[PDB]
Design an enzyme around this catalytic site. Structure first.
Site, PDB file in Angstrom:
ATOM      1  N   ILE A  10       0.752  -1.380  -0.255  1.00  0.00           N
ATOM      2  CA  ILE A  10       0.009   0.133   0.034  1.00  0.00           C
ATOM      3  C   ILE A  10       0.828   1.259   0.055  1.00  0.00           C
ATOM      4  O   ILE A  10       0.433   2.268   0.094  1.00  0.00           O
ATOM      5  CB  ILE A  10      -0.964  -0.030   1.211  1.00  0.00           C
ATOM      6  CG1 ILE A  10      -0.265  -0.273   2.551  1.00  0.00           C
ATOM      7  CG2 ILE A  10      -2.066  -0.757   1.075  1.00  0.00           C
ATOM      8  CD1 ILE A  10      -1.231  -0.800   3.672  1.00  0.00           C
ATOM      9  N   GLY A  11       2.096   1.101  -0.029  1.00  0.00           N
ATOM     10  CA  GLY A  11       3.159   2.191   0.105  1.00  0.00           C
ATOM     11  C   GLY A  11       4.473   1.855  -0.087  1.00  0.00           C
ATOM     12  O   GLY A  11       5.079   0.767   0.065  1.00  0.00           O
ATOM     13  N   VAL A  17       9.345  -0.116   2.862  1.00  0.00           N
ATOM     14  CA  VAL A  17       8.024  -0.482   1.966  1.00  0.00           C
ATOM     15  C   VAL A  17       7.040  -0.954   2.855  1.00  0.00           C
ATOM     16  O   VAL A  17       7.214  -1.491   3.906  1.00  0.00           O
ATOM     17  CB  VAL A  17       8.204  -1.342   0.787  1.00  0.00           C
ATOM     18  CG1 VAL A  17       8.840  -2.796   1.626  1.00  0.00           C
ATOM     19  CG2 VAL A  17       6.799  -1.643   0.251  1.00  0.00           C
ATOM     20  N   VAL A  18       5.819  -0.348   2.735  1.00  0.00           N
ATOM     21  CA  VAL A  18       4.620  -0.728   3.808  1.00  0.00           C
ATOM     22  C   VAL A  18       3.638  -1.776   2.816  1.00  0.00           C
ATOM     23  O   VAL A  18       3.358  -1.701   1.773  1.00  0.00           O
ATOM     24  CB  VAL A  18       3.869   0.444   4.091  1.00  0.00           C
ATOM     25  CG1 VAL A  18       3.115   0.138   5.362  1.00  0.00           C
ATOM     26  CG2 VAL A  18       4.927   1.549   4.502  1.00  0.00           C
ATOM     27  N   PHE A  73      -3.986  -0.401  11.010  1.00  0.00           N
ATOM     28  CA  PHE A  73      -4.271  -0.321   9.790  1.00  0.00           C
ATOM     29  C   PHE A  73      -5.400   0.733   9.475  1.00  0.00           C
ATOM     30  O   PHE A  73      -6.395   0.348  10.219  1.00  0.00           O
ATOM     31  CB  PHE A  73      -4.310  -1.698   8.897  1.00  0.00           C
ATOM     32  CG  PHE A  73      -5.023  -1.600   7.516  1.00  0.00           C
ATOM     33  CD1 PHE A  73      -4.043  -1.424   6.298  1.00  0.00           C
ATOM     34  CD2 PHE A  73      -6.447  -1.814   7.289  1.00  0.00           C
ATOM     35  CE1 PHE A  73      -4.777  -1.515   5.102  1.00  0.00           C
ATOM     36  CE2 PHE A  73      -6.929  -1.670   5.878  1.00  0.00           C
ATOM     37  CZ  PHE A  73      -6.146  -1.629   5.022  1.00  0.00           C
ATOM     38  N   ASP A  77      -5.591   7.275   2.403  1.00  0.00           N
ATOM     39  CA  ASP A  77      -4.896   8.288   3.013  1.00  0.00           C
ATOM     40  C   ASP A  77      -5.606   9.513   2.381  1.00  0.00           C
ATOM     41  O   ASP A  77      -6.375   9.683   1.555  1.00  0.00           O
ATOM     42  CB  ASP A  77      -3.451   8.163   2.685  1.00  0.00           C
ATOM     43  CG  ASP A  77      -3.169   8.151   0.939  1.00  0.00           C
ATOM     44  OD1 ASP A  77      -3.931   9.191   0.231  1.00  0.00           O
ATOM     45  OD2 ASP A  77      -2.119   7.713   0.606  1.00  0.00           O
ATOM     46  N   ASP A 118       7.701  15.211   8.888  1.00  0.00           N
ATOM     47  CA  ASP A 118       7.632  14.990   7.603  1.00  0.00           C
ATOM     48  C   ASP A 118       6.244  14.961   7.142  1.00  0.00           C
ATOM     49  O   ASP A 118       5.795  13.918   6.268  1.00  0.00           O
ATOM     50  CB  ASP A 118       8.426  13.974   7.136  1.00  0.00           C
ATOM     51  CG  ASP A 118       8.374  13.663   5.447  1.00  0.00           C
ATOM     52  OD1 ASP A 118       7.735  14.525   4.799  1.00  0.00           O
ATOM     53  OD2 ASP A 118       8.753  12.477   5.080  1.00  0.00           O
ATOM     54  N   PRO A 121       0.380  14.768   2.861  1.00  0.00           N
ATOM     55  CA  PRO A 121      -1.173  13.979   2.844  1.00  0.00           C
ATOM     56  C   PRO A 121      -1.116  12.784   2.694  1.00  0.00           C
ATOM     57  O   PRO A 121      -1.983  12.068   3.289  1.00  0.00           O
ATOM     58  CB  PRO A 121      -1.601  14.683   1.500  1.00  0.00           C
ATOM     59  CG  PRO A 121      -0.906  16.271   1.223  1.00  0.00           C
ATOM     60  CD  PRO A 121       0.631  15.615   1.593  1.00  0.00           C
TER      61      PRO A 121
HETATM   62  O1  LIG Z   1      -3.036   2.082   7.312  1.00  0.00           O
HETATM   63  C1  LIG Z   1      -2.067   2.450   7.632  1.00  0.00           C
HETATM   64  N1  LIG Z   1      -1.351   2.471   8.717  1.00  0.00           N
HETATM   65  C2  LIG Z   1       0.235   2.499   8.446  1.00  0.00           C
HETATM   66  C3  LIG Z   1       1.005   2.704   9.322  1.00  0.00           C
HETATM   67  C4  LIG Z   1       2.438   2.921   8.666  1.00  0.00           C
HETATM   68  C5  LIG Z   1       2.611   3.439   7.454  1.00  0.00           C
HETATM   69 BR1  LIG Z   1       4.013   4.014   7.008  1.00  0.00          BR
HETATM   70  C6  LIG Z   1       1.422   3.414   6.531  1.00  0.00           C
HETATM   71  C7  LIG Z   1       0.282   2.852   6.928  1.00  0.00           C
HETATM   72  C8  LIG Z   1      -0.912   2.801   6.443  1.00  0.00           C
HETATM   73  C9  LIG Z   1      -1.446   3.052   5.344  1.00  0.00           C
HETATM   74  N2  LIG Z   1      -2.915   2.745   4.732  1.00  0.00           N
HETATM   75  C10 LIG Z   1      -2.919   3.309   3.641  1.00  0.00           C
HETATM   76  C11 LIG Z   1      -4.292   2.836   2.758  1.00  0.00           C
HETATM   77  C12 LIG Z   1      -4.083   3.088   1.405  1.00  0.00           C
HETATM   78  C13 LIG Z   1      -2.851   3.916   0.884  1.00  0.00           C
HETATM   79  C14 LIG Z   1      -1.804   3.888   1.580  1.00  0.00           C
HETATM   80  C15 LIG Z   1      -1.894   3.509   2.807  1.00  0.00           C
HETATM   81  C16 LIG Z   1      -0.776   3.517   3.833  1.00  0.00           C
HETATM   82  O2  LIG Z   1       0.417   3.781   3.836  1.00  0.00           O
END
Ligand SMILES: O=C1Nc2ccc(Br)cc2/C1=C1/Nc2ccccc2C1=O
Length: 274
Positions: A10-11, A17-18, A73, A77, A118, A121
């Site tokens: 998701i990121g 990386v997430v 989670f 965003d 940092d 959005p």
């Molecule tokens: O739900 C999350 N908890 C997190 C904790 C730490 C980090 Br870094 C990212 C996230 C999260 C993200 N949730 C998302 C949903 C759609 C697109 C990108 C992200 C995140 O990035």
């Protein structure tokens, strides 16, 4: 740490990386961030930073020299939410709710001596209940970088987070980034072109900062009514105090919570398409 089955990426965090993942053990769905040693300690510090408007750090897994952070989670965003609301704009009461909740989170962190450093959005997460939360505190976008950082201040304060949040506030309202620079100098000059080149009158000590240069062109400050229309004066006033050049003039999160702009704050719920 093999008690996590990945569901999707998701990121691509600056750090690492997430992944959206699920705990094979406790079954909960989480966000897993695949990341020296004072790291292990300071991050660990973050675990007890618990507030309704801060993404909870659940677990820290150091292993195979592959630091894993397990976070609560959230499905969306603010960046994606802004892009989806671009044509109609986010309604002011929801803009106001989000700003207020974000200020509550920062006032909490800041009161504990933690900075985000940092805010962007992409780092603000929202749920269906109308909540918004600060994510991914730091230990490419320079659009939200406070000018004292761009000018070489190494010992910056909690004010840098207020700067960023003001930039985001502005972008929510107008549906366009306030200062989309594509280099550090471009970023600084976009700020100067709008708020005017700072000098010793409005920012004592500015011409003594490490990256300050006398050769900086001198722009006049733009009409503040020109910057975020059609936001009302309550709004413009709060934003101007969030964008003060001088970090010690910039409003604190706690004071910002008391500004008249929040006299009528409420908590609507966004219509989210997950
Ligand atoms: O739900 C999350 N908890 C997190 C904790 C730490 C980090 Br870094 C990212 C996230 C999260 C993200 N949730 C998302 C949903 C759609 C697109 C990108 C992200 C995140 O990035």
């Amino acid at each position: 740490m093999e008690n996590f089955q990945k569901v999707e990426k998701i990121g691509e965090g600056t750090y690492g990386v997430v992944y959206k993942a699920r705990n094979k053990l406790t079954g909960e769905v989480v966000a897993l961030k695949k990341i020296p040693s004072t790291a292990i300690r300071e991050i660990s510090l973050l675990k007890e930073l618990n507030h309704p408007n801060i993404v909870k750090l659940l677990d820290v897994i150091h292993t195979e020299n592959k630091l894993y952070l397990v976070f609560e989670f959230l499905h969306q965003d603010l960046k994606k939410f802004m892009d989806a609301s671009a044509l109609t704009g986010i309604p002011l009461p929801l803009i106001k709710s989000y700003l207020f909740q974000l200020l509550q989170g920062l006032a909490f962190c800041h009161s504990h001596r933690v900075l985000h450093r940092d805010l962007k959005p992409q780092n603000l997460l929202i749920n269906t209940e109308g909540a918004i939360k600060l994510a991914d505190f730091g230990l490419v976008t320079l659009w939200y970088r406070a000018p004292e950082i761009l000018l070489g201040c190494k010992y910056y304060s909690t004010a840098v987070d207020i700067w960023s949040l003001g930039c985001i506030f502005a972008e929510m309202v107008t549906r366009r980034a306030l200062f989309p620079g594509d280099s550090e100098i471009d970023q600084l000059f976009r700020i100067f072109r709008t708020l005017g080149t700072p000098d010793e009158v409005v920012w004592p000590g500015v011409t003594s900062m490490p990256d300050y240069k006398p050769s900086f062109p001198k722009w006049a400050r733009q009409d503040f009514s020109k910057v975020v229309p059609p936001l009302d004066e309550d709004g413009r006033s709060l934003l101007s105090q969030m964008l003060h050049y001088d970090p010690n003039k910039r409003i604190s999160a706690k004071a910002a919570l008391a500004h008249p702009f929040f006299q009528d704050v409420t908590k609507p719920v966004p219509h989210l398409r997950l």
